[PDB]
Amino acid sequence: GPHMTDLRKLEALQALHAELVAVRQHRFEGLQVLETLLEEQTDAFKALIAKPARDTKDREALGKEPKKLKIGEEEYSLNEDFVNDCLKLADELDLNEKESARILIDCDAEGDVETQSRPLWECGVIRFHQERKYLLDCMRLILEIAADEDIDAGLQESFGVAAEDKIFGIPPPWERQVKKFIPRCMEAMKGVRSMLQCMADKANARNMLQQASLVRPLDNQETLDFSRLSLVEQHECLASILHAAVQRHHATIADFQDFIKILRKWDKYDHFLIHLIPVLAAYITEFGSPEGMGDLQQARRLNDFICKGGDEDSWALPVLGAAVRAWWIAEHNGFYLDDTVQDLRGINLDEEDEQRTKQFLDALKEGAFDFILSVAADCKAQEWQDPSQLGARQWLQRKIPSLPSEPFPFSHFLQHSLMVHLEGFVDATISNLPDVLRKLRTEEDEQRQLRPNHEQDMDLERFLIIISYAYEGRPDAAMSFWEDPDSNLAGFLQWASRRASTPLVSAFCEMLRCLADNEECATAAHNFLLDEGHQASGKMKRSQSLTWSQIFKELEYFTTKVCSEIEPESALMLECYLRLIAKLATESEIARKRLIMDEDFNLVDTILKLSVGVIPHRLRACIFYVLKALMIRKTHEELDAMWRWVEAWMTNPFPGPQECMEMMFREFGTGFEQSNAFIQLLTTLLVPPEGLNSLNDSVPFPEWLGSSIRTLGIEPYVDFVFDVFANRTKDISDPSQLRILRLSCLDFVMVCLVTFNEDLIVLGHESNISIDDAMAATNLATYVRLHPFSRVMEWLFNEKVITSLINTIHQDPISLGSASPDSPLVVSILRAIQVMIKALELQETYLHLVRPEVLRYQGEAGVRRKPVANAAYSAFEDGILSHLSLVVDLGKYCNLGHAELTLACLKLLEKIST
């Protein structure tokens, strides 16, 4: 890449980082400049963010002779103001006065005071932390490159030795008082933790006075927030590096013991702790697993150090210790599976598998699986919710305290690493402790049979949920269930599907849904739920309880009950069933067709019945999302069939059918969850089978739709979406849901506009319609009538609808810039703007061609579709440009750094401006 010759420490580290990213993204154009920067940071690399201690000699010097500063080779001149910033920086960071001065000179020189507009001493803080973070992330990248199997073996290995040498301080194979790496790494992480704490304490005290007196943010609050986030990211990088050191066999038993001792003293469930969980897993896999070291005289000695010798106050977080014991036992019991690979003579398999099973089951009662599940849930926790899975994996009890509410999202490399180890743990217990799982099941069944009103243990359920996270979004890994029916994991799947309690069935369907993230996996799950070649004479499938048959019999029953309250467990189960149906349908064409064209299941017809009855909104939402799932891909026959289905129940839900339709629309638009889902459904039903952005001379639904009782076309449906967007959104309190719902509405609109083939209509006017044999002038003329384009345009000329577009676009620019480009906030604004652009691009074809044809038609018909357009607006500009906020916001947003958004603001501004 392009760089200057004499880069200062930070800029140098940033350069190296950029080169490392390149190599990591398979760009080897700058390997030569990468190496030059590597050797340039050798010292810093071995120093591992070591922080020079504050000193009296330099303090006494700085103030007494505040004139000429000499650092290393060069000379600078101090002004009484600069010298004060050094003392301020040295205090804030408890840093060497000289090192502080150096940092401030790099700040002044590079002039990041103006680049970040902050006091000089604050810039020092930021630079100090930037250097640390980049240094550590460079190491993480080097290790990550050393493990990249998709690059030249030579590079992969040379980066390996580089990592061994520069990071872990292990000389290369061709050569050779020091403190071993891991001990240094642990001290480094310790420093970071304490610096965050010390920083938090000081900040708390100062904020307390701030909020009490001035009730406004601290002057350096931005720098504070940044320093916290960094420190946490630093620890995360160190935790990743440590994890690498362990796997690379650089750890000693002592290191393993010192680590466990550190976990034993750990007295807070926080982000730092979760960073160490992968490290723990590696340590367990190294010193106790079958795959790791195999000195059992030691692997068992450690067992007594981990489990036995249990003092009552040995763990500050007893629940953590439980998780540690469980994890260890799961991996350590793998030694005793076979003899072809291991020597098991002298071992009391009987008494031990007894005592092991006991102390493991005890761990579960102590909260082992509540801790592990909570760690997985928090690590994979997303920032915004997918409305189609609200409640999923959220119904099991949790005694583990929430993570401190912080803006500390876990890096992908940490999340992935953790999931990989959970996969191992899941595999270990399933294959090493099947006995324990059978007992859990019997224990829980026995519980809800004899103590229906008492707290039921849910550790078996938790286990399935843990599995769901481990394999979530990883089909390659998930195939280990669908590959070999004789395998352990595949067996566990079949064992779980046996007759189960409602909670365990829900937990199972939750699991399956996360084991179907592609065509192959989804198809496998689909075939699994079938009675495959098994109408009779069942080997696997006779004992199997959970099947499509049971699912559709359970659904079919609940429909007769509700149409003549549902119990929480029942509701949950039905919701898990539906979410599962939806998942497979969208991921598997085989599954989709079967589900939609099966007379035994009668899926569509039955779930539509269910929606008519009085059911919880979240359950009806699940129904709508299934209907959408069956339409994600589609043909014309299926599509027409679906529209026929929907119309049937909208009008005849078992007095006037159109009055019944009013009834159903008013209900479906009630509340976020179900209104959002229904609008999502209608949107999908309008996306042609040929795909969005297609050009065909046909409306995407049965032309004769509504022919029986109403105005032909889907105007009642379009009117519904706009009534939500325009009026019903007023009832949504939660901002993020308001945004999601608005986005849904706007996507519906966008689809109505995009699928309108204007090029086809314009060509018609001049030629086909008036000056030639016109068989098809009618054909297109009818198209112009039925396509939602007319009605959608008519709505876009409505006062309220325009106001809502403005309201959607008008948002707090500060929180807008902080938002993610994919967040509903940004995207909902973008989509609103994009609707305005599209409207402007099509309003001519609408005003001089479509509108008059539609107004003409009804003249003789009779129906005067209740007016929605505002006669005051002769053009779309007359409406939107009456809101001065609009053009102002467009200008503002260009400066918020959201490329796609800005790009849209410009497109619209050009159409508006003079």
**DSSP collapsed to 3 states, 141-198:** HHHHHHCCCCCCHHHHHHHHHHHHHHHCCCCCCCCCCCCCHHHHHHHHHHHHHHHHHH
Return d(Cα 380, Cα 465) in angstroms, integer: 13
The kind and range of the H/E element at 106 are helix 97-110
Using CB atoms within 10 Å of the CB of residue 580, give its burial: 0 to 12 exposed, 13 to 18 middle, 19+ buried: buried
Residue with tokens 């006065």: 97
What is the C-alpha radius of gyration for the chain, rounded to an integer number of angstroms? 33
Q: What's the domain count of the chain?
A: 1
DSSP letter (8 states) at residue 111: T
User: Which residues lie closer than 8 Å to 424 by C-beta, 6 or more apart?
Assistant: 281, 285, 331
- Residue 401, phi then psi, degrees to nearest 5: -65, 150
* Percentages of the chain per state (helix, strand, coil), in multiples of 5: 65, 0, 30
Buried b (16+ CB within 10 A) or exposed e, 739-761: bbbbbbbbbbbbbbbbbbbbeeb
- Tell me which H or E stretch contains 596: helix 589-596
The residues, any chain, with a CB within 8 Å of residue 694's CB and separated by 6 or more, are 688, 755
**Quick one: which of 899, 737, 896 has its CA closest to 818?**
896
CA–CA separation, 843 and 850 (whole Å): 9
| CA 889 – CA 905 distance, rounded (Å) | 9
The C-alpha atoms of residue 786 and residue 85 are separated, in whole angstroms, by 72
| C-beta separation of 873 from 881 below 8 A | no
At 136, which amino acid appears? L
Q: Which residue has the tokens 């401030």?
A: 104
Tokens 């691009």: give the residue: 841
Partnered with residue 74 across adjacent β-strands are: 71
Quote the CA–CA distance of 565 and 569 in Å, as a whole number: 12
Provide the 10 A C-beta neighbour count for residue 711.
Answer: 16
What does the H/E/C string look like for 687-726?
A: CCCCCCCCCCCCCCCCCCCCCCCCCCCCHHHHHHHHHHHH
**Which one, of 31, 28, 33, 25, lies nearest residue 5 by Cα?**
33
Residue with tokens 């026959």: 637
Outline where DSSP puts E strands in 438-585.
none
Residue owning tokens 């690399």 = 45
CA nearest 200: which of 406, 403, 381?
Answer: 406
* Angle in degrees, 0-180, between the axes of helices 672-685 and 636-651, rounded to the nearest 10: 140
CB neighbours of 210 closer than 8 A, spacing ≥ 6? 216, 217, 218
> Is-contact 182 238, C-beta < 8 A?
no
Domain interval for residue 750: 4-914
**Three-state SS for 76?**
strand
Helix or strand (DSSP H, E) at 277: helix 271-287
- DSSP secondary structure string, 611-652? HHSS--HHHHHHHHHHHHHTTSS--HHHHHHHHHHHHHHHH-
What is the spatial distance between Cα 303 and Cα 316, in angstroms, rounded to a whole number? 20
- Give CA 51 to chain center in angstroms: 36
Helix (H) or strand (E) holding 77, with range, is: strand 74-77
Query: Which two tokens mark 242?
Result: 């440590």
Task: Tell me the two tokens of residue 235.
Answer: 């620890």
Task: Report whether 768 contacts 780 (CB < 8 A).
Answer: yes
Which of 59, 229, 24, 254 minimizes the C-alpha distance to 140?
Answer: 24
Retrieve residue 870's tokens.
């505002």
179 backbone dihedrals φ, ψ, rounded to 5°? -95, 120
Contact in structure between 759 and 840 (CB atoms under 8 Å): no
- Judge whether 90 and 97 are in contact, CB under 8 Å: yes
User: At CA 755, angle to CA 753 and CA 759, rounded to 5?
Assistant: 90
Place of tokens 């224990």: 443
Contact 414, 240 (CB under 8 A): yes
User: Is there a contact between 765 and 780 (Cβ–Cβ < 8 Å)?
Assistant: no
Is-contact 124 107, C-beta < 8 A? yes
- How is residue 729 annotated by DSSP? G
Q: How far apart, in whole angstroms, are the C-alpha atoms of residue 761 and residue 763?
A: 5
CA-CA distance, 103 to 98, in Å (whole number)?
9
Q: Is 793 helix (H, G, I), strand (E, B) or coil?
A: helix
CB burial class (10 A; 0-12, 13-18, 19+) of residue 889? buried
Resolution (A): 2.7
| 301: its two tokens | 């000695």
Among residues 627, 625, 588, 589, the alpha carbon closest in space to that of 605 is found at 627
Residue 352 parent element (H or E): helix 349-365
Q: Is 75 helix (H, G, I), strand (E, B) or coil?
A: strand
Structure tokens at 307: 């489990």
C-alpha span between 260 and 274 (Å, rounded): 14
Residues 6+ apart with CB under 8 A from 558: 566, 570, 574, 610
Give Dmax over CA atoms of the chain in angstroms: 101
As a whole number of angstroms, the distance between CA 602 and CA 556 comes to 9
Taking the mean position of all CA atoms in its chain, how far away is CA 764? 48
Angle at 96 between CA 92 and CA 102, to 5 degrees: 95
Query: What are the tokens at 886?
Result: 């609009």
Q: What span, in angstroms and rounded, lies between the C-alpha atoms of 113 and 118?
A: 5
User: Hunting for tokens 């763990």 — which residue is that?
Assistant: 315
> In whole angstroms, what is the distance from residue 520 CA to residue 525 CA?
9
- The structure's method of determination equals X-ray
Pull the structure tokens for residue 703: 């032309």
Q: How far apart are the first and last CA of the chain?
A: 42
User: Residue 372 phi/psi, 5° resolution?
Assistant: -65, -40
For tokens 């707290």, the residue is 455
